[PDB]
Amino acid sequence: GPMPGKKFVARVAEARAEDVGKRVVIIPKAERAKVGIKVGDVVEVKKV
Amino acid sequence: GPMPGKKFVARVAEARAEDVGKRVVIIPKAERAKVGIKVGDVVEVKKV
């Protein structure tokens, strides 16, 4: 596979029934408060 | 709110029915190939 540290850009969404089976990162409320995330916000996801 | 650029660490999961209504980042197959993500992998999410 690729070396670690690569990233992509995405938007935080509200999960719906049609998303069952998709690959997701779940962002709990406490983490949203810490990093300042609202649904609709652009985030960058990096593989560690 | 906070300044942008803060992050938290999480693991990529398969979304289930119990996740409906949660805040998520959906990672499509093409992006998983580009960054080398598998379900179970640790990622870092940053607010832009």
What's the β-strand tally of chain A?
4
Distance between the ends of chain A: 13 Å
Name the beta content range of chain A: 35-45%
Q: How many DSSP helices of chain A?
A: 1
Q: Which strand order does the major sheet of chain A show? A: 1-4
Looking at the structure, what is the overall shape of chain A?
globular
What would you call the structural class of chain A?
Answer: alpha+beta
Please explain how this structure is put together.
- 2 copies of one chain form a homodimer.
- With 48 residues, chain A is an alpha+beta fold.
- Chain A has one domain.
- Helix content of chain A is 15%, strand content 35%.
- Chain A contains 1 helix and 4 strands; from the N terminus they run βββαβ.
- The A-B interface holds A 1-4, 6-17, 19-27, 29, 31-32, 34-37, 39, 41-48 and B 1-4, 6-17, 19-27, 29, 31-32, 34-37, 39, 41-48.
Summarize the topology.
Two copies of one chain form a homodimer.
Chain A: E1 7-11, E2 13-14, E3 23-26, H1 29-35, E4 42-47
Antiparallel strand pairs in A: 1-4
Question: What keyword list fits this structure?
Answer:
Ph1, alpha+beta, dimeric, 35% strand, homodimer, two-stranded antiparallel ribbon, 48 residues, dna binding protein, Double zeta beta barrel
